[PDB]
Design a protein around this ligand. Structure first.
Ligand SMILES: Cc1cc2nc3c(=O)[nH]c(=O)nc-3n(C[C@H](O)[C@H](O)[C@H](O)COP(=O)(O)OP(=O)(O)OC[C@H]3O[C@@H](n4cnc5c(N)ncnc54)[C@H](O)[C@@H]3O)c2cc1C
Ligand SMILES: NC(=O)c1ccc[n+]([C@@H]2O[C@H](COP(=O)([O-])OP(=O)(O)OC[C@H]3O[C@@H](n4cnc5c(N)ncnc54)[C@H](OP(=O)(O)O)[C@@H]3O)[C@@H](O)[C@H]2O)c1
Ligand SMILES: [Mg+2]
Length: 309
């Protein structure tokens, strides 16, 4: 039932591609499609952008593309805009299974006057709105790919991977999970446990929910899926249900998975990390263990993968 992908030679590279294109001479790619991923009650629009790179900017799952929006640097006249990085939300074969496209998961950065609620498009985010405003056939200046922290360790195809995302931080995990469960990749037959924790504002802010729910039904012994809907659910203390609260629910089980060698990944808002770290520390110290030492050991054993901003 897995999807045929091509071309298999994307499996042959021994090292991840890195900085194939640089800001000084970006690759001119072409938009294939842009679609909203969210419902009307979502607090902002998050869009899914499919980009045709023609096979010229291949990548591994977990990497990022840079995008240079058009225009001049506002704080450097005569100069191009700075690169904005976006975690790639597709597998190396991309959403058309042909190794020609990659996808981004982009939240429109929109400014509202805090008192009047008044929108002001002059203060909106340049690149995020450029991308979600794009249309088929538009050109995109691409750099990269970049990133090694979030590469998926594939040495053990029965490994455990605990994936913790807030909002568009889900992007790399869509790529991981498609590779683990959707695509017919003969050199990676995942037989382990993948456990996605996703925190979003409300049910309408869910990103790729139908896809992840399909893995639940198709691979119930290998995929688990927990959601923290911050504006629809309350945690034990009556505060907003964030991912660190959902982790807390399973904290015993997670710590045991981590002691057995599981990988844990964090992507999204940097603000979630103190709360997550506080949750795991409580479990360690419950057990009589120094969290500082355990975290240092997790990093030395390459189990601890953080890319937040
Ligand atoms: C490794 C990495 C991966 C990333 N992955 C993703 C991803 O997958 N998806 C994603 O959506 N983002 C991601 N980001 C963030 C992304 O790189 C951009 O920073 C983000 O999209 C906003 O950039 P922008 O060009 O839209 O906004 P910018 O134009 O850079 O503006 C920055 C912010 O300032 C605000 N602003 C501008 N002028 C004013 C003003 N005068 N007063 C008040 N506010 C103002 C804008 O509204 C915006 O919120 C990632 C970041 C990193 C480092
Ligand atoms: N590789 C990377 O570095 C990477 C990749 C993708 C995205 N990002 C970054 O990740 C962020 C994604 O944000 P978004 O705009 O898509 O999401 P968002 O809607 O701003 O937030 C996502 C969810 O996280 C919750 N949240 C807010 N503060 C939190 C905290 N301190 N701890 C835990 N949860 C918290 C939000 O709840 P409330 O809004 O109800 O408070 C919401 O439910 C962006 O800043 C983006 O630039 C980075
Ligand atoms: Mg929806």
């Amino acid at each position: 039932s897995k999807v045929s992908v091509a071309p298999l030679h994307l499996e042959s590279a021994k090292e991840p591609p890195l900085n194939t294109y640089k800001p000084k001479e970006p690759f001119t790619a072409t938009i294939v499609s842009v679609e909203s991923l969210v419902g009307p009650k979502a607090p902002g629009e998050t869009c899914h952008i499919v980009i045709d790179h023609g096979g010229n900017v291949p990548y591994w799952e977990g990497q990022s593309y840079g995008v240079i929006p058009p225009g001049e640097n506002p704080k450097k006249p005569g100069a191009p805009q700075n690169v904005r990085l976006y975690s790639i939300a597709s597998t190396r074969y991309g959403d058309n299974f042909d190794g020609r496209t990659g996808s981004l998961c982009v939240r429109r950065a929109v400014y509202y006057d805090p008192e009047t609620g008044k929108e002001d498009p002059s203060k909106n985010g340049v690149c995020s709105n450029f991308l979600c405003n794009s249309k088929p056939g538009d050109k995109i200046q691409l750099t990269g790919p970049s990133g090694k922290i979030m590469l998926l360790p594939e040495e053990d195809p029965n490994a455990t991977h605990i994936m913790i995302a807030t909002g568009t931080g889900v992007a790399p995990f869509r790529g991981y999970l498609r590779r683990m469960f959707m695509e017919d990749v003969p050199n990676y037959r995942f037989g382990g446990l993948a456990w996605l924790f996703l925190g979003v504002a409300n049910s309408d802010s869910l990103l790729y929910d139908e896809e992840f729910t399909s893995y639940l039904k198709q691979y119930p012994d290998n995929f688990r899926y927990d959601k923290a809907l911050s504006r629809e659910q309350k945690n034990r203390s009556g505060g907003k249900m964030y991912v660190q609260d959902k982790i807390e629910e399973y904290s015993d089980e997670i710590f045991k998975l981590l002691d057995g060698g599981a990988h844990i990944y964090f992507c999204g808002l940097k603000g979630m990390m103190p709360g997550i770290q506080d949750t795991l520390k409580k479990v360690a110290e419950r057990r009589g263990e120094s969290w500082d030492q355990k975290l240092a050991q997790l990093k030395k054993n390459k189990q601890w993968h953080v890319e937040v901003s």
